[PDB]
Design goal:
globular, transferase, nucleoside, about 450 residues, alpha/beta, 3 domains, 4-stranded mixed β-sheet, binds chloride ion, thymidine phosphorylase, about 15% strand, Transferase, Pyrimidine Nucleoside Phosphorylase, Chain A, domain 3, Pyrimidine Nucleoside Phosphorylase, Chain A, domain 2, homodimer, Aldehyde Oxidoreductase, domain 3
């Protein structure tokens, strides 16, 4: 009912809302008792007035509870229920090696993920490059895999934090997207619906990032750690570098290639290593599967080096109806692009910057991403062999290998990639992959 | 399109909106091209950041030109085009007197109006307890009567400021009605579209004030005066008391009766007198039909004592198709209620408070108003011989005479009247009828 307008009026005048009041309104959104205009007004009043830590927690936990919430206490599993979440990036593929890695270390990873939003990639989209992959198993199969494999990566049923559906949509047309409380709500409500004991948040800083500035990434990470632990879920955040492409490849099929190679030890991008190992370590300590960073890293290094994690991945893949030989034979399964050639800079120099948002857009343009929610994706296109900041570039040393649908396509990404990368005469500042660790 | 959202962001960030941006939005609301959530978000940004003077004239005139705008210059009239507008209240019958009064003072008063909403009855619902009274003459009939009588009172014979409808509806459920620049536009746009040379605004203060506070009431009065003058109309406003019924009666038919009695001289409520006179003085001074209060009061006293104003009223009832002998014979025409009995307080003491809102809402529930515009008004029901603040009440002194279809609606209304009125052992302090005059 129209108690709603009174809660709006209350927030408007600068009064904090209560848990009952926030729950009412959120449930109002799910059940369509509350109009889009009422949705807009409250969002606006929250942009201006913001929200106290308690209001923030109430907002998240109300949204989480608006849908179905997962309970694994029933299954008496040997270890903690954990996950990672990330704000996104280009060539940020960490989840693919992380779920298996943590899972091979005794965690249980019910990773319910999503489709690529603009220039950033989706994890689901990458996995759909694997032939036969099912991101939508029945909830009970889903429980089988978790128990038998230890990780599964699946798509949102529709039953999950549904309040966010109408609330985010309205935010998008009303200029209320940018508010940290409303963002901490959207970001966390879904992940918390998984019934986790622990969570680590990856908050990217730099040009590629959601947040426009570092102090804002830091404000968002602190909000999230604050609200999550408040929700009963042990949580830390890492601030990690999105100033260049994290992996050496960006796309779908091409990212899954580098995932397998990483696990099997075929190839490991040192920065992608830094960020993946850092996120996992946070998962193992916050789940008491390790005493300390050193012991965490000790376990993780082993599972990664001896193929365990690779096996876990294959098994999970097999389990989700992908090839049973996929880890070994990934070669023959993944789509390859019809045109794959390197692009070279017009000058020699050291790479001193790149616009990572731009590169990411080059990939959507080639077909690797959607602008529309219904755009179809070509899984073969993208970049590989990406050059890194401070790399020496010349006629021998290409900026990247572009994978495209045709020559038309390839020439255009070749423009974007040359324009997005900046060359200098001196190897610039060498930036840390991980900036700080944020806790309660 | 959805640069509507960009307008919202601009206002949100604290900028002034252009006239152009404001007419794009206003017209977008009339034309459906902008949705409910955007309306509500913009409204809320306007609640927070207010608006400047040219913003305000832009809003009001964008609304005004969203629909037809009258022009009287063709009919070549001697004497000014002048009207009265009011935020409304229980028992405010001033229009029915003042129209004839000022018309009889040589000016032209095209009062255009609406039905009742909430606790306040519309002037047109009052005029419609007169048998046959026609609130919808067609265009030349409207023009004819004004030339002849000098006044007429009608509903909107056209669409005057259509953009106000989605905008007020959305405001009324989003807690955005309280915004002075938005109110001002609503309240003024319909009146400016009337093509007036002058206007006086009656802003009620007290328990019947539209605004939550007296100090919000001044600002409203002050904002209306500024914009109207900025819109080209010579405008002043009075802040007048609604802490109780203005007239001695409230209803439709019962109000018409007292209304007529005022004019013919049978009874004149001093407080109703105070306000009516002062509003008329404004119309005469601003419409340059007199040079100061003193001269203006002379003239209106004359037409009140010499019968010309009462006369103007009858002509106007016959011209508008109610009985032509109505002034003389009104008790033959006006329907009596089914049950008339005085209602008594259950304690003894002075009347300290009167909840006027609760009173109109008592009339509505009697069948006096309409909560749906689809209802059936019973024109007879209502209240007469209202007790007034400061009156000493005992077992022989009635709070009012109640007029109700049956004893069951009587006993419900009586309940409401005793809920309307607070007694206690000390008489309250007096209040002026008119608090202040606002010009320039
Ligand atoms: Cl008298």
């Amino acid at each position: 009912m129209f108690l709603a307008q009174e809660i709006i009026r209350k927030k408007r005048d600068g009064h904090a809302l209560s848990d009952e009041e926030i729950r009412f309104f959120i449930n109002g959104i799910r059940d369509n008792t509350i109009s889009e205009g009422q949705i807009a007004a409250l969002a606006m009043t929250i942009f201006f007035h913001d929200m106290t830590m308690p209001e923030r927690v109430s907002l998240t936990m109300a949204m989480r509870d608006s849908g179905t919430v997962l309970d694994w206490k029933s299954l008496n599993l040997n270890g903690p229920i954990v996950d990672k979440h990330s704000t996104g990036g280009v060539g940020d593929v960490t989840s693919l090696m992380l779920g298996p890695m943590v899972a091979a270390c005794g965690g249980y990873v019910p990773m319910i993920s999503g489709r690529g939003l603009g220039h950033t990639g989706g994890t689901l989209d990458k996995l759909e490059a694997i032939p036969g992959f099912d991101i939508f198993p029945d909830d009970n199969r889903f429980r089988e895999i978790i128990q038998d494999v230890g990780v599964a990566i699946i798509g949102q049923t529709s039953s999950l934090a549904p309040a966010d559906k109408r609330f985010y949509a309205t935010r998008d047309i009303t200029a209320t997207v940018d508010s940290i409380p409303l963002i901490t709500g959207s970001i966390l409500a879904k992940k918390l619906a998984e019934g986790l004991d622990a969570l680590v948040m990856d908050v990217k800083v730099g040009s590629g990032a959601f947040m426009p500035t570092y102090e804002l990434s830091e404000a968002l990470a602190e909000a999230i750690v604050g609200v999550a632990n408040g929700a009963g879920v042990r949580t830390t955040a890492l601030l990690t570098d999105m100033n260049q492409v994290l992996a050496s490849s960006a796309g779908n099929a091409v990212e899954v290639r580098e995932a397998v190679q990483f696990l099997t030890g075929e190839y490991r991008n040192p920065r992608l290593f830094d960020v993946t190992m850092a996120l996992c370590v946070e998962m193992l300590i916050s789940g008491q599967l390790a005493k300390d960073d050193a012991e965490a890293r000790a376990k993780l290094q082993a599972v990664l080096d001896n193929g365990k994690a690779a096996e876990v991945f294959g098994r999970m893949v097999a389990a989700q109806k992908g090839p049973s030989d996929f880890v070994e034979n990934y070669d023959k399964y993944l789509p390859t692009a019809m045109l794959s050639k390197a692009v070279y800079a017009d000058t020699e120099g050291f790479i001193s910057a790149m616009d990572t948002r731009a590169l990411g857009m080059a990939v959507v343009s080639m077909g690797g991403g959607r602008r529309q929610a219904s755009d179809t994706i070509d899984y073969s296109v993208g970049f590989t062999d990406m050059a890194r900041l401070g790399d020496s570039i010349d006629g021998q040393r290409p900026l990247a290998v572009i994978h495209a649908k045709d020559e038309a396509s390839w020439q255009e990404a070749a423009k974007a990639v040359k324009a997005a990368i900046i060359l200098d005469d001196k190897a610039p500042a060498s930036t840390p992959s991980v900036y700080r660790r944020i806790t309660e």
